[PDB]
């Protein structure tokens, strides 16, 4: 009956496409055509951080917009003070191959993960005075690509096993598993209300998941691997930067592809995607060794950072919008303003 | 202008930087290697050989030192077939060790395809490959039987003659070496099809009982270091 199931699936996919086209009366560019452009957005490298020894694969800001954690292939997880360049912590990882780092909203814990398939959660507010591995979540069957905190006790982790997981840290078990993707899930963004999250994978498709219920609400379709994903500040849209030199903006309430940010002179791959606080600026890091700032509504380039010697592997905008931190494969983080 | 606490924080940062400089010296003095191969290929045998004689976990590490030079060799398990996404973590490894089972001709063609994918990879475009054509005691026992001819799997073998070059000095049947050199050339051609800096393939013939694999790796890595010295320091 596999033929019958495949035919029903094809008919349902065609119905989804027809319904999605029935709501595309106007395109985002048409509505945005009247509002004035941002103009040149020139941001200068204020503070540069020179502690790591190898390529930086991830960063994450803290909710205080002051501290930030960076993970390097040298087996180090450095918690930096942005304002003073001071190094607050230097956690030595048990595995040197780290692809993701997360800073808990409370500032107490910091998460790392990579080829070891383990999500290592480290405690920073211990009475002993040294950072210790609080827990090691060890249920994945593939490399960790992204970990984000929901609170001090729950984490969400995307892995190369085509599955995402929601872990209760104290129990150490996968509370929920998300099992829709057909390829390596490479990025992950958590909604501001922390009830939904979008995951981008190598199947050229993003998927929106309900954390509480475990299901996949809706799937958005790109023509290469989606390497970065980030919600709009609204919580009703998100952006996916992929291996083809495109960052696409989708909207949940319409189940569409609102805009496609691309340029004929960009042939590299987007590694990281972030939004400005207003949501009007979409910052994307590229293999071209530089970050491009797009206008998220007019779909035109607004600026170029261009201060790195190797590919920009991580990007993050603070909660207060003061700074955009870029981490590249040259062991340097740069705080642009 | 800094406060007392700010000065203490700066001093703590300088202490962290000192430990980071020590870790930098340790990280530089060690050579990272990546070990690839198929399940058929004898690959855990090689890690055992260079360990003894010198769960769902993903990365396996096998440290070993040769002539006071430390090597960290990484094997990647508990990962699926797709490799294009975690292979980027190995842009800076000194050498990629590829183990190909020369005994099995049926799976040989896909071994060449994996080698081609590794060789022509945008991230390993500057990464040398040390190639181990493993399980050759089984190759001799297979070619001295006549029940499996390479022509049944590689049609070009019938028109191949051993080159007027090196030969195994000890007693080896002159068509054992013909087949072995054909397997070698099938990889050497792919290596020389698209060559660049730091991108050179070192082919070696090995077995499970062989205890000299570590010396081979050390010599090849020394040559890789010499080439990077000749390039990054403008000598070529």
């Amino acid at each position: 009956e596999l033929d019958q199931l495949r035919q029903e699936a094809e008919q349902l996919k065609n119905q989804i496409r027809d319904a999605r086209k029935a709501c595309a009366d106007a395109t985002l560019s048409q509505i945005t055509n009247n509002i004035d452009p941002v103009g040149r957005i020139q941001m200068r490298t204020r503070r540069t951080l020179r502690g790591h020894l190898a390529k930086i694969y991830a960063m994450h800001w803290g909710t205080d917009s002051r501290l930030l954690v960076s993970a390097s292939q040298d087996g180090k997880l450095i918690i930096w003070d942005s304002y003073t360049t001071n190094k607050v912590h230097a956690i030595p990882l048990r595995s040197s191959w780290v692809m993701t780092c997360a800073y808990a909203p409370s500032g107490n814990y910091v998460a790392c993960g990579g080829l070891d398939n383990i999500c290592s959660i480290y405690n920073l507010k211990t009475r002993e005075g040294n950072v210790r591995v609080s827990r090691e979540l060890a249920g994945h069957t593939g490399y960790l690509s992204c970990c984000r905190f929901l609170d001090d006790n729950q984490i969400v982790t995307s892995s190369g096993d085509t599955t995402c997981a929601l872990w209760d840290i104290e129990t150490g078990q996968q509370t929920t598993t998300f099992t829709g993707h057909t390829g390596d899930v490479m990025s992950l963004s958590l909604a501001p209300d922390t009830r939904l999250f979008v995951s981008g994978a190598c199947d050229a498709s993003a998927k929106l998941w309900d954390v509480r219920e475990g299901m996949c609400r809706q799937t958005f379709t790109h023509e290469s691997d989606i390497n970065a994903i980030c919600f709009f500040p609204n919580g009703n849209a998100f952006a996916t930067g992929s291996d083809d030199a495109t960052c696409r903006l989708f909207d949940l309430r319409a189940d569409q592809e609102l805009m496609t940010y691309s340029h004929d002179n960009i042939i590299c791959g987007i590694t990281s995607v972030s939004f400005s606080k207003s949501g009007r600026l979409l910052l994307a890091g590229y293999d071209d060794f530089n970050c491009n700032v797009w206008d998220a509504l007019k779909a035109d380039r607004a600026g170029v950072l261009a201060g790195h010697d190797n590919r920009v592997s991580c990007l993050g905008v603070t909660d207060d919008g003061m700074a955009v931190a870029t981490g590249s494969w040259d062991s340097f983080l740069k705080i642009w303003n | 202008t800094l406060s007392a606490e700010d000065k203490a924080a700066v001093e703590r940062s300088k202490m962290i930087e000192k430990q980071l400089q020590k870790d930098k010296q340790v990280y530089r003095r060690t050579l990272r290697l990546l070990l690839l191969g198929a399940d058929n290929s004898g690959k855990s045998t090689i890690v055992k050989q260079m360990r003894i004689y010198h769960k769902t976990s993903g990365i396996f590490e096998t440290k070993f030192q040769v002539d006071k030079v430390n090597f960290h060799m990484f094997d990647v398990g508990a990962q699926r077939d797709e490799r294009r996404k975690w292979i980027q973590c190995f842009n800076d490894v000194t050498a990629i060790i590829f183990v190909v089972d020369s005994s099995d001709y049926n799976r040989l063609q896909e071994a060449l395809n994996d080698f081609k994918s590794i060789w022509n990879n945008r991230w390993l475009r500057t990464i040398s490959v040390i190639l181990f054509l493993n399980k050759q005691d089984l190759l001799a026992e297979k070619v001295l039987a006549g029940k499996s001819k390479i022509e049944d799997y590689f049609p070009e073998f019938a028109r191949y003659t051993t080159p007027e070059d090196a030969t195994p000095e000890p007693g080896e049947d002159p068509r054992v070496t013909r087949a072995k050199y054909f397997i070698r050339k099938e990889f050497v051609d792919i290596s020389t099809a698209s060559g660049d800096g730091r991108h050179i393939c070192y082919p070696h013939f090995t077995c499970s009982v062989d205890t000299e694999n570590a010396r081979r790796i050390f010599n090849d890595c020394k040559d890789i270091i010499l080439q990077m010295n000749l390039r990054e320091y403008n000598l070529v």
């Epitope: 607050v88 002993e128 005075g129 | 406060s3």
Partner: single-chain antibody, 230 residues
Framework: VQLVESGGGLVQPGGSRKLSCSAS????????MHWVRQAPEKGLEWVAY????????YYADTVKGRFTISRDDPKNTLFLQMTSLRSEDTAMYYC??????????????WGQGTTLTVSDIVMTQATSSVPVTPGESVSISCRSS???????????LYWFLQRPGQSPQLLIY???NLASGVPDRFSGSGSGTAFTLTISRLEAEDVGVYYC?????????FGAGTKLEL
């Protein structure tokens, strides 16, 4: 965390004595270490400070030259070598743990102290004794001759509590933050040169002497301390 100090006793004036505090239960090598003292019936007075890595040592004016502070990190023990003692140096000496980074709380743990008997941002706390009854809010005020609001943004005031017959315990660090393990009823507020600690719904086992300590510039100055009695 545990931190036990020993080496006290009777010293004839002009002698020399080595106090040693052994720290067990935390990363001693990554914490700065202070030596403070309390006279037989007086307030706290900072003596010395040895930084992590032994790269920054500070002494008090009434202490410089006579006293040498040092630490043995592998053995996890800090030593105060006191030379040419005087009658004014008799005190219970406390060894104070203190780490320094962004968000850190210095002066968390205090030792049990060693009794030794020998045979400047002035901080004033006018209330030397405030009568109190359990269940009522209390306010202890401290002033300073120099504003503690540094240009970075944070004021470096520390509120300590010393229960009868016990070592001082940190209550508030940097004038608004609450220490780890202290009840939420304690609150700190104020501006430079004027600070107030408010205990809402005082409950016994919080009576004792309350001290205010400045950390803007060395030497660190304490206060007389308000004595809350039930």
């Amino acid at each position: 965390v545990q931190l036990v100090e020993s080496g006290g006793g009777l010293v004839q004036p002009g002698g020399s004595r080595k106090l040693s505090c052994s720290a067990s239960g935390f990363a001693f090598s990554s914490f700065g270490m202070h030596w403070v003292r309390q006279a037989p019936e007086k307030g706290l007075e900072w003596v010395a400070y040895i930084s992590s890595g032994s790269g920054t040592i500070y002494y008090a004016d009434t202490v410089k030259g006579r006293f040498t502070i040092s630490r043995d990190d592998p053995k996890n023990t800090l030593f105060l070598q006191m030379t040419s003692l005087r009658s004014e140096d008799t005190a219970m000496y406390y060894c104070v743990r203190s780490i320094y980074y962004y968000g850190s709380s210095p002066f968390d743990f205090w030792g049990q102290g060693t009794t030794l008997t020998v045979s400047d941002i002035v901080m004033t706390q006018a209330t030397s004794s405030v009568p109190v009854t359990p269940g009522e809010s209390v306010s202890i005020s401290c002033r300073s001759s120099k504003s503690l609001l540094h240009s970075n943004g944070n004021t470096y005031l520390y509120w300590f509590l010393q229960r009868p017959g016990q070592s001082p315990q940190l209550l508030i660090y940097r004038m608004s933050n609450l220490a780890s393990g202290v009840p939420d009823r304690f609150s700190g507020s104020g501006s430079g040169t004027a600070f107030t600690l408010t205990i809402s719904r005082l409950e016994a086992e919080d009576v004792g002497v309350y001290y205010c300590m400045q950390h803007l510039e060395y030497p660190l100055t304490f206060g007389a301390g308000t004595k809350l009695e039930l």
